[PDB]
Amino acid sequence: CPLMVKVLDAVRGSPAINVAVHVFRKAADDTWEPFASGKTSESGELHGLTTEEEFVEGIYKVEIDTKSYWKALGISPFHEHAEVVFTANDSGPRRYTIAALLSPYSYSTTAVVTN
Amino acid sequence: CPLMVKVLDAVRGSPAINVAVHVFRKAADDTWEPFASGKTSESGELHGLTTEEEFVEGIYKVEIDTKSYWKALGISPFHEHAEVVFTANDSGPRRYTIAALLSPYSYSTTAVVTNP
Amino acid sequence: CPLMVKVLDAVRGSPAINVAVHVFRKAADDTWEPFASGKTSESGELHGLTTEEEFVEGIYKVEIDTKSYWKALGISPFHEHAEVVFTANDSGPRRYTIAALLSPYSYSTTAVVTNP
Amino acid sequence: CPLMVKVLDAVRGSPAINVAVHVFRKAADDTWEPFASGKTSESGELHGLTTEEEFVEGIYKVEIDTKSYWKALGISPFHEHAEVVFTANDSGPRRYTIAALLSPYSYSTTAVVTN
Numbered sequence: 001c002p003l004m005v006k007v008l009d010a011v012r013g014s015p016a017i018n019v020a021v022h023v024f025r026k027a028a029d030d031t032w033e034p035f036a037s038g039k040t041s042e043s044g045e046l047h048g049l050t051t052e053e054e055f056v057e058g059i060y061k062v063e064i065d066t067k068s069y070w071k072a073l074g075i076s077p078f079h080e081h082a083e084v085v086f087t088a089n090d091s092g093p094r095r096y097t098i099a100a101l102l103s104p105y106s107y108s109t110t111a112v113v114t115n
Numbered sequence: 116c117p118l119m120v121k122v123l124d125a126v127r128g129s130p131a132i133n134v135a136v137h138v139f140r141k142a143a144d145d146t147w148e149p150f151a152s153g154k155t156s157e158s159g160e161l162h163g164l165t166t167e168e169e170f171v172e173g174i175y176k177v178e179i180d181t182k183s184y185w186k187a188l189g190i191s192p193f194h195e196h197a198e199v200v201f202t203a204n205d206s207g208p209r210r211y212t213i214a215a216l217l218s219p220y221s222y223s224t225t226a227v228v229t230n231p
Numbered sequence: 232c233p234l235m236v237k238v239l240d241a242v243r244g245s246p247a248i249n250v251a252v253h254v255f256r257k258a259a260d261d262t263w264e265p266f267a268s269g270k271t272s273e274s275g276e277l278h279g280l281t282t283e284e285e286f287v288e289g290i291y292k293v294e295i296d297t298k299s300y301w302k303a304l305g306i307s308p309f310h311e312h313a314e315v316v317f318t319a320n321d322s323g324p325r326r327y328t329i330a331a332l333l334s335p336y337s338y339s340t341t342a343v344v345t346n347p
Numbered sequence: 348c349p350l351m352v353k354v355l356d357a358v359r360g361s362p363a364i365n366v367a368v369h370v371f372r373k374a375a376d377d378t379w380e381p382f383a384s385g386k387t388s389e390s391g392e393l394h395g396l397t398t399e400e401e402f403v404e405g406i407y408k409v410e411i412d413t414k415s416y417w418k419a420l421g422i423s424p425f426h427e428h429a430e431v432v433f434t435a436n437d438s439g440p441r442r443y444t445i446a447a448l449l450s451p452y453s454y455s456t457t458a459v460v461t462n
Contacts, residue, residue: 111221336458
């Protein structure tokens with residue numbers, strides 16, 4: 001599993017469950033092409049997005065659908081979504097976890113890149 | 116001043132100076148149209164991007180060029196840029212401060228929105 | 232103004248107003264001695280805590296009363312308070328801004344330190 | 348395992364390994380008494396701090412020794428340590444993860460409290 005996403009809710013102190021996540025890869029015409037997507041599990045994680053064979057070097061974008069997540073909790077959010085854009089590199093460590101911590105008007109995202 | 120951007124460096128504990136920032140507005144046709152751009156100052160702030168008149172309702176995207184920033188300090192960072200995407204002015208004009216706090220493999224962004 | 236505190240509410244996207252803040256300085260004897268205190272204003276800022284003269288080298292602790300804050304808005308938060316502990320002025324006088332960004336079960340704190 | 352700590356390094360994009368963590372419980376004379384301590388593992392985690400029997404309701408403080416961690420990387424830090432202070436409650440969910448994300452001049456901490 002080369003690319004995993006983990007999302008937390010800073011308001012409830014809990015995983016952010018059932019959050020839609022869409023990943024895109026930049027194509028040679030500079031557009032974003034759908035690459036992988038899913039919904040975070042009960043532990044706030046999304047696994048099984050891609051495989052080592054398919055996850056080649058390139059520029060990827062991970063879009064986390066935060067606004068629908070907050071609307072379903074009845075809390076007015078600021079952002080349309082949270083967006084993480086990065087270059088995957090074979091010289092780096094082999095596994096990428098994109099973590100995100102969500103509040104209605106604020107989020108952080110951290111990449112944890114390991115062996 | 117309805118839209119301002121403030122950027123901090125979490126490594127040095129200082130403003131992030133000379134950070135390029137590009138703002139786009141989602142078009143009628145669904146594309147991102149260029150809306151305004153500038154660089155942060157010595158205080159890590161970017162003012163004067165737009166006017167209440169020009170800054171109408173819409174979906175806006177504030178792209179902060181964090182990669183050039185880290186690279187010019189000798190660091191190879193994770194993200195290409197930070198992107199902040201939000202609907203603005205849909206309940207009337209507001210003043211928006213988009214803050215970002217940067218580290219090489221992490222950032223956070225916070226909006227402070229006040230009723231002018 | 233060598234020491235200032237700024238507090239934001241990540242839920243509402245606004246300054247956190249009326250947040251009580253207590254500052255302590257580590258004593259000669261190792262205890263935390265009361266150093267200064269105040270409440271954030273309408274802009275979520277606390278100024279005038281100390282003076283360059285009084286603010287000497289030492290280890291300081293800035294305690295931000297985040298629990299009273301959330302509770303007065305009907306939220307039962309995780310933390311009793313946020314505590315920020317740092318050595319100050321050990322390479323000469325500096326100006327310190329202690330920023331905090333609050334959510335019910337999370338906060339972050341950032342120092343911006345500049346050479347006056 | 349009722350209380351776990353997980354620490355990440357925002358500068359290197361990695362778990363924060365070998366970070367000392369000390370936990371204290373507030374005693375009836377208002378002092379902090381040592382309760383549990385350890386060093387984060389290679390995955391940035393610390394487990395086995397306490398047991399459900401011993402972790403009773405009370406006010407606890409978790410001190411994460413960030414300053415020594417940054418000094419060992421040769422990076423000048425701001426804080427002496429990061430401190431998380433909270434009341435454990437039996438009405439809450441039964442497991443507490445104190446997560447912390449560290450930079451030299453900034454840190455965040457989040458409690459993820461689950462079943």
